[PDB]
Design an enzyme around this catalytic site. Structure first.
Site: not given
Ligand SMILES: CC(C)(C)c1cc(=O)[nH]c(SCC(=O)c2ccc(Cl)c(S(N)(=O)=O)c2)n1
Ligand SMILES: [Zn+2]
Ligand code: NA
Length: 257
Positions: A93, A116, A91, A61, A195-196, A103
């Site tokens: 986007h 992020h 990470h 992702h 956001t995912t 985003e």
């Molecule tokens: C978030 C977690 C449950 C570890 C996860 C599960 C998944 O299936 N796919 C992904 S990919 C995106 C990601 O790792 C992540 C983790 C924490 C946050 Cl706060 C965010 S964000 N995009 O809200 O900052 C993204 N992550």
């Molecule tokens: Zn993010």
């Protein structure tokens, strides 16, 4: 199954994760004119002097740079927060074009990318428990615009070729995330979600006013990454952003001006 394509993109996520249509989804457009200035907001405290990066992963992702969060070594506090939050990972986007990728938007403007830095509230003991709580996470969002290079990002851009496809990881030690920060820590804050998927409503969002600059060649290298696994057909990792969601009954606060 969820992803960022025509058939499995943000518009489809609600079928697996009904909270996609909930009361505090992220990201949002930040309307800089109706965000409320709050002189009681504290300066943000970013203590990254002792950060231990460990590893970089392509999870299909995005790519995550992960840190040792088993001790208070890189913490976020202050700002709108009452807790202490440990950095677990960062990470990005980004878009297929420099005109999109972020985003969050600011007065409807899209940035080429968004960083992020994800942190979890030490009071819940670990990341998995924190995401189940309305105050479990604090995410520091930083916009990227294309211009001069960010020297502090290059060690990241240079390892991407070793994690090109989904599932690849590489050792990534002694990376200093302070090299990704803009000069000012002025911010907007609101309550929102991952956001995912699973889109859990557990995030206090802290989005910095000042974008960092990265070069066109730096962002170009993000776009050479793949959503697919090795030896499956090539789908470039681009446009892995969720669009702005309705603000609903929330007020965005500003630490400034
Ligand atoms: C978030 C977690 C449950 C570890 C996860 C599960 C998944 O299936 N796919 C992904 S990919 C995106 C990601 O790792 C992540 C983790 C924490 C946050 Cl706060 C965010 S964000 N995009 O809200 O900052 C993204 N992550
Ligand atoms: Zn993010
Ligand atoms: Na350039």
């Amino acid at each position: 199954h969820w992803g960022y394509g025509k058939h499995n993109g943000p518009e489809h996520w609600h079928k697996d994760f009904p909270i996609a249509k909930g009361e505090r989804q992220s990201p949002v457009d930040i309307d800089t004119h109706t965000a409320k200035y709050d002189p009681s907001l504290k300066p943000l405290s970013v203590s990254y002097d002792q950060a231990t990066s460990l590893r970089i992963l392509n999870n299909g992702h995005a790519f995550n740079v992960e840190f040792d969060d088993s001790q208070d070594k890189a913490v976020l506090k202050g700002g709108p927060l009452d807790g202490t939050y440990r950095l677990i990972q960062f990470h990005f986007h980004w878009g297929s074009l420099d005109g999109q990728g972020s985003e969050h938007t600011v007065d409807k403007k899209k940035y080429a990318a968004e960083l992020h830095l994800v942190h979890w509230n030490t009071k819940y003991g670990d990341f998995g428990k924190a995401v189940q709580q309305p105050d479990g996470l604090a995410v520091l969002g930083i916009f990227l615009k294309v211009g001069s290079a960010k020297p502090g990002l290059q060690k990241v851009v240079d390892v991407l070729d070793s994690i090109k496809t989904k599932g690849k990881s590489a050792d990534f030690t002694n990376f200093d995330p302070r090299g990704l920060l803009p000069e000012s820590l002025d911010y907007w804050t609101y309550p929102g979600s991952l956001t995912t998927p699973p889109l859990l409503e557990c995030v206090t969002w802290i989005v910095l006013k000042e974008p960092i600059s990265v070069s066109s060649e730096q962002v170009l290298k993000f776009r050479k990454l793949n959503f697919n696994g090795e030896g499956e057909p090539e789908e470039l990792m681009v446009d892995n952003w969720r669009p702005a969601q309705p603000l609903k009954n929330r007020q965005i606060k500003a630490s400034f001006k």
